[PDB]
Amino acid sequence: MPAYHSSLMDPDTKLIGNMALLPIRSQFKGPAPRETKDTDIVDEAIYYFKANVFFKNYEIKNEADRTLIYITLYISECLKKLQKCNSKSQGEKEMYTLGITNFPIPGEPGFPLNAIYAKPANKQEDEVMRAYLQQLRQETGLRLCEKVFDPQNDKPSKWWTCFVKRQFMNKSLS
Amino acid sequence: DREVGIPPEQSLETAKAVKERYSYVCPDLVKEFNKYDTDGSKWIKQYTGINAISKKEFSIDVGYERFLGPEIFFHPEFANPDFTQPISEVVDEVIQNCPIDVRRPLYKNIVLSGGSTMFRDFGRRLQRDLKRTVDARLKLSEELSGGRLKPKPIDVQVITHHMQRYAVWFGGSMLASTPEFYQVCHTKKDYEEIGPSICRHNPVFGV
Amino acid sequence: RTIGAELMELVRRNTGLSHELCRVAIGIIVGHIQASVPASSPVMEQVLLSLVEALPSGQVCHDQQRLEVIFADLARRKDDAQQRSWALYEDEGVIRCYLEELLHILTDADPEVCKKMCKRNEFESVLALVAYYQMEHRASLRLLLLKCFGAMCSLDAAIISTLVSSVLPVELARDMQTDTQDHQKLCYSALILAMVFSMGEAVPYAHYEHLGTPFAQFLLNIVEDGLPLDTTEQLPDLCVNLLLALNLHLPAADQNVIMAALSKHANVKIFSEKLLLLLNRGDDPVRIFKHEPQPPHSVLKFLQDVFGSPATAAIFYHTDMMALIDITVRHIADLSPGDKLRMEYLSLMHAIVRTTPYLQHRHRLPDLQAILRRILNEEETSPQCQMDRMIVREMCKEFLVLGEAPS
């Protein structure tokens, strides 16, 4: 059967490059509009993370799938740093520092999906992309730390750090 | 990946034990991950083994591998990337490739055999993934025709019979106890004449 | 233009020499035809410069080809699920042949080749052996993999971060507590564990199920009591160097898993005797590799953490603490200003006064008082020298009798 795709795409949803500039519920600042609903492109990708890393074939139906694939690849970067953390406060400090890092973007080397992603043509669209992703890289990390850490010991769970070796298909943002 | 502490010599012994005892089949995959996360005391079991060198016990926590193993019947790209089709869909192609007159009686008698169909709730999901697939096809034809006839539904049935560890043997013992067996059996005489190509053919192919 | 690199490849193929001796043989031959035949000196000097100072376009090294062929089969034999758990064919002689060949290449060939082919595709080939080790149960092959990991740690430090963050240290720490019969595998396992922990990088929290306090008690029981099968007695001096290396990344001695092992042990004497024979010389046995950034001094890091609590300070016998004060004092003075270590011995000494009754016996207190007054009256202005004086003031301020004049 197929993997889990994004249901949130709507024709009224803006496009950046060939991705889906979708609303995000965050206190962080960026080009992403603020959402009112109780579900977002982030809460989905965290719902569907543990299941989508076992599949080996993903068919890109729309552009919101290109936004989900990015997060699902970045969550595997959070867990590499979080498994080394001994307290949630130490994780939130590590999740900040990682989002500030300038990962590759569509068009340049490092990005594993340069072919099936559309780079920004103009410089203004480039500046919007680098600030949309950084808004995802920050709210993703902030929301994992609520889940990874067992409140009984305030230390990472083996049920999340078992997916450290499970890349999305085999790709990584590095 | 998770439970180090299992000796490498007793990983296989430990996986069969988990499979035969604790595993099962899930209706939906991602909803089970939440049930294991949100309410972990109810779904996570524990398996105490015995080392064979030191004779000391080792214990582990049995989690997502209760439903992820059997899921490859329905998501076989978990293990083998050379296969994607579920078994719920392989069965529909097997039957829809058969003659039009024996499609209904074949949906109505689907016999699960073998030891790897002993999983709990295996037929319940297979019988459900088909009835979704069969009730839609009849719906589409009813629409293209004009909606004048509501065709009869198909009675899918997936039965799981009492003998599985020796089902195939039993059908060989009933057979061999007949006299008809001693006619179709290739014979020593027929071997000396025709040679070892007497046993070359199977029903899967012709000529 | 490229002769000196095309000759080294020819010589390593047809002779089997290492990279170093490949350059020696050519520099000697050339350097001798230059001298005996001066008519050929212009040609020879170009040839020597090509050595001192790349390969043709399509030409690829022999050692690079083999590492494509070795890492590819061993990963194919890892992805062979049938043959690993359900054996049918023989595999011990083929694998033993590819792992021997691998060990001679990492040990002899050019490190930059053996670095890139191990650093390729985010350490895809290293991480496979780390899994094949977890999957393999035969000690004839687990031993060769360890000799191969020990050669990959010598090349780069990014590989050490890859291994320590992996499941390797948890399988070694689990195989050592379980399979104590094999002596070589127990001695190499304790060497590799000290290699990968040498740099001080932190690790996942899950490692501390098998690298925590019960693993330290296992190592202390060996240091103190030893094993029967240890005839040559290498293992205590390896289980010491390992404890020093586990304690490198571990901060906050009150939260330290190792120190809970000492305070739980009945009586440690042999572990303490060996710590002082290393401090008397100031040798870091963990520091095997010349990789930057150089981590701290493993011994002083340990003793600073021992004397970070009074439960762990009482392990030292009376005669040994007085020998520790005689050494620490001797190093504080014999060390020059601007050195990094002088503040460690000072912080170590500050830790002794707090957690021990040093002020009741006052061993070598006058010689100490004269050294601290000197260090304060030093007019050096480096930042490091200001860190030393900053410690001394805190030390005298906390304990006034270390500021009084020697009398």
PDB file of N, CA and C in Angstrom, chain A residues 64-111:
ATOM      1  N   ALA A  64       2.803  19.881  -1.147  1.00  0.00           N
ATOM      2  CA  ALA A  64       2.843  19.706   0.298  1.00  0.00           C
ATOM      3  C   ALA A  64       3.636  18.469   0.691  1.00  0.00           C
ATOM      4  N   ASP A  65       3.675  17.459  -0.177  1.00  0.00           N
ATOM      5  CA  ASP A  65       4.526  16.306   0.075  1.00  0.00           C
ATOM      6  C   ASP A  65       5.994  16.697   0.100  1.00  0.00           C
ATOM      7  N   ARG A  66       6.377  17.726  -0.657  1.00  0.00           N
ATOM      8  CA  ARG A  66       7.761  18.176  -0.648  1.00  0.00           C
ATOM      9  C   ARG A  66       8.106  18.914   0.632  1.00  0.00           C
ATOM     10  N   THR A  67       7.102  19.437   1.331  1.00  0.00           N
ATOM     11  CA  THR A  67       7.320  20.063   2.626  1.00  0.00           C
ATOM     12  C   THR A  67       7.363  19.017   3.730  1.00  0.00           C
ATOM     13  N   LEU A  68       6.563  17.963   3.592  1.00  0.00           N
ATOM     14  CA  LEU A  68       6.563  16.891   4.576  1.00  0.00           C
ATOM     15  C   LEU A  68       7.862  16.105   4.528  1.00  0.00           C
ATOM     16  N   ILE A  69       8.375  15.859   3.324  1.00  0.00           N
ATOM     17  CA  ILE A  69       9.612  15.108   3.167  1.00  0.00           C
ATOM     18  C   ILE A  69      10.777  15.838   3.812  1.00  0.00           C
ATOM     19  N   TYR A  70      10.767  17.168   3.776  1.00  0.00           N
ATOM     20  CA  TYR A  70      11.855  17.931   4.372  1.00  0.00           C
ATOM     21  C   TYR A  70      11.870  17.755   5.881  1.00  0.00           C
ATOM     22  N   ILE A  71      10.710  17.918   6.511  1.00  0.00           N
ATOM     23  CA  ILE A  71      10.613  17.802   7.960  1.00  0.00           C
ATOM     24  C   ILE A  71      10.987  16.398   8.400  1.00  0.00           C
ATOM     25  N   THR A  72      10.423  15.396   7.729  1.00  0.00           N
ATOM     26  CA  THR A  72      10.728  14.004   8.013  1.00  0.00           C
ATOM     27  C   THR A  72      12.211  13.693   7.876  1.00  0.00           C
ATOM     28  N   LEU A  73      12.938  14.466   7.077  1.00  0.00           N
ATOM     29  CA  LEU A  73      14.384  14.352   6.994  1.00  0.00           C
ATOM     30  C   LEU A  73      15.090  15.133   8.085  1.00  0.00           C
ATOM     31  N   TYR A  74      14.471  16.203   8.574  1.00  0.00           N
ATOM     32  CA  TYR A  74      15.074  17.009   9.623  1.00  0.00           C
ATOM     33  C   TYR A  74      14.838  16.408  10.996  1.00  0.00           C
ATOM     34  N   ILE A  75      13.737  15.681  11.170  1.00  0.00           N
ATOM     35  CA  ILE A  75      13.486  15.014  12.440  1.00  0.00           C
ATOM     36  C   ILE A  75      14.554  13.971  12.716  1.00  0.00           C
ATOM     37  N   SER A  76      15.121  13.374  11.673  1.00  0.00           N
ATOM     38  CA  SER A  76      16.221  12.444  11.868  1.00  0.00           C
ATOM     39  C   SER A  76      17.514  13.149  12.244  1.00  0.00           C
ATOM     40  N   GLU A  77      17.592  14.464  12.045  1.00  0.00           N
ATOM     41  CA  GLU A  77      18.723  15.246  12.516  1.00  0.00           C
ATOM     42  C   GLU A  77      18.537  15.705  13.948  1.00  0.00           C
ATOM     43  N   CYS A  78      17.293  15.918  14.368  1.00  0.00           N
ATOM     44  CA  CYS A  78      17.033  16.259  15.757  1.00  0.00           C
ATOM     45  C   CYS A  78      17.427  15.119  16.678  1.00  0.00           C
ATOM     46  N   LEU A  79      17.019  13.902  16.331  1.00  0.00           N
ATOM     47  CA  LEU A  79      17.203  12.763  17.215  1.00  0.00           C
ATOM     48  C   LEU A  79      18.660  12.379  17.372  1.00  0.00           C
ATOM     49  N   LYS A  80      19.505  12.710  16.401  1.00  0.00           N
ATOM     50  CA  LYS A  80      20.928  12.445  16.545  1.00  0.00           C
ATOM     51  C   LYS A  80      21.531  13.281  17.662  1.00  0.00           C
ATOM     52  N   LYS A  81      21.063  14.516  17.815  1.00  0.00           N
ATOM     53  CA  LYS A  81      21.540  15.404  18.862  1.00  0.00           C
ATOM     54  C   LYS A  81      20.799  15.211  20.171  1.00  0.00           C
ATOM     55  N   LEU A  82      19.546  14.768  20.117  1.00  0.00           N
ATOM     56  CA  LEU A  82      18.739  14.646  21.319  1.00  0.00           C
ATOM     57  C   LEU A  82      19.076  13.408  22.128  1.00  0.00           C
ATOM     58  N   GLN A  83      19.506  12.332  21.475  1.00  0.00           N
ATOM     59  CA  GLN A  83      19.845  11.126  22.210  1.00  0.00           C
ATOM     60  C   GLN A  83      21.017  11.344  23.152  1.00  0.00           C
ATOM     61  N   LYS A  84      21.867  12.322  22.865  1.00  0.00           N
ATOM     62  CA  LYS A  84      22.992  12.678  23.711  1.00  0.00           C
ATOM     63  C   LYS A  84      22.613  13.598  24.862  1.00  0.00           C
ATOM     64  N   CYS A  85      21.380  14.081  24.911  1.00  0.00           N
ATOM     65  CA  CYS A  85      20.957  15.051  25.905  1.00  0.00           C
ATOM     66  C   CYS A  85      20.425  14.345  27.142  1.00  0.00           C
ATOM     67  N   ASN A  86      20.712  14.925  28.306  1.00  0.00           N
ATOM     68  CA  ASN A  86      20.317  14.373  29.592  1.00  0.00           C
ATOM     69  C   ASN A  86      19.162  15.123  30.238  1.00  0.00           C
ATOM     70  N   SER A  87      18.627  16.151  29.587  1.00  0.00           N
ATOM     71  CA  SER A  87      17.530  16.920  30.149  1.00  0.00           C
ATOM     72  C   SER A  87      16.859  17.697  29.031  1.00  0.00           C
ATOM     73  N   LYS A  88      15.546  17.881  29.171  1.00  0.00           N
ATOM     74  CA  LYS A  88      14.777  18.564  28.135  1.00  0.00           C
ATOM     75  C   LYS A  88      15.271  19.984  27.923  1.00  0.00           C
ATOM     76  N   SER A  89      15.640  20.667  29.005  1.00  0.00           N
ATOM     77  CA  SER A  89      16.194  22.009  28.890  1.00  0.00           C
ATOM     78  C   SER A  89      17.445  22.010  28.028  1.00  0.00           C
ATOM     79  N   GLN A  90      18.241  20.945  28.110  1.00  0.00           N
ATOM     80  CA  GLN A  90      19.417  20.820  27.263  1.00  0.00           C
ATOM     81  C   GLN A  90      19.051  20.536  25.815  1.00  0.00           C
ATOM     82  N   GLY A  91      17.875  19.969  25.569  1.00  0.00           N
ATOM     83  CA  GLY A  91      17.450  19.673  24.218  1.00  0.00           C
ATOM     84  C   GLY A  91      16.909  20.890  23.509  1.00  0.00           C
ATOM     85  N   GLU A  92      16.083  21.664  24.212  1.00  0.00           N
ATOM     86  CA  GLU A  92      15.579  22.913  23.658  1.00  0.00           C
ATOM     87  C   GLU A  92      16.714  23.854  23.294  1.00  0.00           C
ATOM     88  N   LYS A  93      17.811  23.812  24.049  1.00  0.00           N
ATOM     89  CA  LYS A  93      18.982  24.608  23.717  1.00  0.00           C
ATOM     90  C   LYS A  93      19.713  24.049  22.505  1.00  0.00           C
ATOM     91  N   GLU A  94      19.658  22.733  22.301  1.00  0.00           N
ATOM     92  CA  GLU A  94      20.272  22.133  21.124  1.00  0.00           C
ATOM     93  C   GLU A  94      19.384  22.258  19.896  1.00  0.00           C
ATOM     94  N   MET A  95      18.067  22.319  20.083  1.00  0.00           N
ATOM     95  CA  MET A  95      17.163  22.463  18.952  1.00  0.00           C
ATOM     96  C   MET A  95      17.158  23.877  18.409  1.00  0.00           C
ATOM     97  N   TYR A  96      17.381  24.869  19.266  1.00  0.00           N
ATOM     98  CA  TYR A  96      17.568  26.223  18.772  1.00  0.00           C
ATOM     99  C   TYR A  96      18.787  26.284  17.868  1.00  0.00           C
ATOM    100  N   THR A  97      19.934  25.847  18.390  1.00  0.00           N
ATOM    101  CA  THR A  97      21.206  25.994  17.693  1.00  0.00           C
ATOM    102  C   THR A  97      21.206  25.314  16.334  1.00  0.00           C
ATOM    103  N   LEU A  98      20.394  24.276  16.167  1.00  0.00           N
ATOM    104  CA  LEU A  98      20.376  23.534  14.915  1.00  0.00           C
ATOM    105  C   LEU A  98      19.565  24.257  13.848  1.00  0.00           C
ATOM    106  N   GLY A  99      18.418  24.824  14.226  1.00  0.00           N
ATOM    107  CA  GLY A  99      17.625  25.581  13.275  1.00  0.00           C
ATOM    108  C   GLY A  99      18.345  26.796  12.734  1.00  0.00           C
ATOM    109  N   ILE A 100      19.176  27.432  13.562  1.00  0.00           N
ATOM    110  CA  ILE A 100      19.966  28.567  13.096  1.00  0.00           C
ATOM    111  C   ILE A 100      20.955  28.128  12.030  1.00  0.00           C
ATOM    112  N   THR A 101      21.357  26.861  12.046  1.00  0.00           N
ATOM    113  CA  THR A 101      22.325  26.374  11.078  1.00  0.00           C
ATOM    114  C   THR A 101      21.737  26.433   9.677  1.00  0.00           C
ATOM    115  N   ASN A 102      22.551  26.880   8.725  1.00  0.00           N
ATOM    116  CA  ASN A 102      22.100  27.078   7.350  1.00  0.00           C
ATOM    117  C   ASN A 102      22.322  25.782   6.590  1.00  0.00           C
ATOM    118  N   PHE A 103      21.318  24.913   6.634  1.00  0.00           N
ATOM    119  CA  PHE A 103      21.338  23.693   5.865  1.00  0.00           C
ATOM    120  C   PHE A 103      21.279  24.029   4.382  1.00  0.00           C
ATOM    121  N   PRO A 104      21.528  23.055   3.510  1.00  0.00           N
ATOM    122  CA  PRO A 104      21.315  23.293   2.083  1.00  0.00           C
ATOM    123  C   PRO A 104      19.858  23.607   1.796  1.00  0.00           C
ATOM    124  N   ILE A 105      19.625  24.124   0.594  1.00  0.00           N
ATOM    125  CA  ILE A 105      18.283  24.460   0.135  1.00  0.00           C
ATOM    126  C   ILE A 105      18.079  23.851  -1.245  1.00  0.00           C
ATOM    127  N   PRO A 106      16.864  23.863  -1.775  1.00  0.00           N
ATOM    128  CA  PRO A 106      16.665  23.438  -3.162  1.00  0.00           C
ATOM    129  C   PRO A 106      17.512  24.214  -4.153  1.00  0.00           C
ATOM    130  N   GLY A 107      18.444  23.511  -4.786  1.00  0.00           N
ATOM    131  CA  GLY A 107      19.239  24.058  -5.866  1.00  0.00           C
ATOM    132  C   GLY A 107      20.727  23.861  -5.683  1.00  0.00           C
ATOM    133  N   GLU A 108      21.185  23.846  -4.433  1.00  0.00           N
ATOM    134  CA  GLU A 108      22.602  23.801  -4.120  1.00  0.00           C
ATOM    135  C   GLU A 108      23.011  22.415  -3.644  1.00  0.00           C
ATOM    136  N   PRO A 109      24.310  22.107  -3.637  1.00  0.00           N
ATOM    137  CA  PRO A 109      24.747  20.797  -3.148  1.00  0.00           C
ATOM    138  C   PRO A 109      24.410  20.588  -1.683  1.00  0.00           C
ATOM    139  N   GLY A 110      24.460  19.323  -1.279  1.00  0.00           N
ATOM    140  CA  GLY A 110      24.087  18.922   0.060  1.00  0.00           C
ATOM    141  C   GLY A 110      22.652  18.453   0.105  1.00  0.00           C
ATOM    142  N   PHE A 111      21.791  19.138  -0.624  1.00  0.00           N
ATOM    143  CA  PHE A 111      20.393  18.763  -0.660  1.00  0.00           C
ATOM    144  C   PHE A 111      20.255  17.453  -1.428  1.00  0.00           C
TER     145      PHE A 111
END
